[PDB]
Amino acid sequence: GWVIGVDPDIGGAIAVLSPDGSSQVFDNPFVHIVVSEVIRKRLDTKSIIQLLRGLDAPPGTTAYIEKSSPFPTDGKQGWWSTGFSYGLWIASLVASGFSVVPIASQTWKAYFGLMRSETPADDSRQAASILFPDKDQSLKLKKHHGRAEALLLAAYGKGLVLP
Amino acid sequence: GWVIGVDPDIGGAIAVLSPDGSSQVFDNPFVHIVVSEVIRKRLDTKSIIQLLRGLDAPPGTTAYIEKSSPFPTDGKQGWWSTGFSYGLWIASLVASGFSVVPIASQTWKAYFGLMRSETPADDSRQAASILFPDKDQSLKLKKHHGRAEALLLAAYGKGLVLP
DNA sequence: CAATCGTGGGAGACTGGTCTCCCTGCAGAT
DNA sequence: ATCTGCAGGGTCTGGTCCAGACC
DNA sequence: CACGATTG
Ligand SMILES: [Mn+2]
Ligand SMILES: [Mn+2]
Ligand SMILES: [Mn+2]
Ligand SMILES: [Mn+2]
């Protein structure tokens, strides 16, 4: 009963669920780098691999990762970034011994009843708070939706249900 | 002593230069996958990590990889792929214990005097044929320019010079 | 299979149709 | 530090920005 | 560079 969930974007997170029901969630490590004479956030490859190497989850644990699906109206830098983040995470997960299962955002949203909300990020945090009450304090900021998404991905993969 | 050169695109390659002067070059592994009801080529994450595991190059060996730099006129799918291929390779290389150094294409081209050619692919293969004569049969086809690019990147890292 | 060409493009889940979904990169306000 | 709003965008290297190059 | 063709 080990499951990993990964929201791969720059404000994303990785959640780890263990057989005893406990949970962990880590913000995606990033660094500030210079691109075309401005500052950009990019995921921190070496920190991600060290994080994955430090997990207690055994080899073969399944990691559910949100499928990249940039909108056609998103700009070309958005497409590059979502592609880059996805490839960095997939390779790090495979290299660390995990079985990687891409999941569409539509799949886990429909599973928890979060399709077509007016406030989708607030709702994600509320749903994750109910599934993981001991994470309640770690979900109270609006910027914490990435943590919520990672936890709901993992919850999906484990088959948890809302009460 | 040991140097790795990576041309990360879908027709790219990885070259490995041993201290005894011998060289190897491998085509980037890929699979065919379905995206939006059409077939696409995508780099094969599992094969890439197995290839890196099988190399004799010791940990800490430097891997030179061409920096991603898509043109603004390239479409958003081009930006996504070059982003994805770059992230996949960088994470694979770090996870396998290699030290990663991104090199702009302008840098290794100017170093071998290949700037501003009317036939840049052909010239790359000729330059790599001269630097690595035992790879001459592996460079006869025009689609082998990715092999040439990987070898030239590695040659740049090693400080080799054309005669 | 290997080469060449022209243009720059969503993708996904539930016999095609339909409808839903992610961001990045800046800026400014507090 | 945190939130919100709007539009969708190159980046790099050699030599105080410019110029010219590249996938 | 990708992508989706077409040409021997
Ligand atoms: Mn997400
Ligand atoms: Mn997210
Ligand atoms: Mn290249
Ligand atoms: Mn290439």
Author numbering:
A (entry chain B), B (entry chain A): 109 to 271
The authors write:
Holliday junction resolution is a crucial process in homologous recombination and DNA double-strand break repair. Holliday junction (HJ) is a four-way structured DNA intermediate formed during the homologous recombination. Canonical HJ resolvases introduce two symmetrical nicks across the junction center by functioning as homodimers, and exhibit strong structure- and sequence-specificities in HJ cleavage. The RNase H-like enzymes, including RuvC and MOC1, typically feature three or more conserved carboxylates, known as the DDE motif, in their active sites.
To capture this transient metal ion, we mutated a critical residue K229, in vicinity of scissile phosphate. K229 is conserved across the RNase H superfamily that includes RuvC. Crystals were soaked into Mn2+ containing solution over various durations prior to X-ray data collection. Following incubation the crystals with Mn2+ for about 180 s, we were able to detect the occupancy of metal ions at both A and B sites, as revealed by the anomalous difference map.
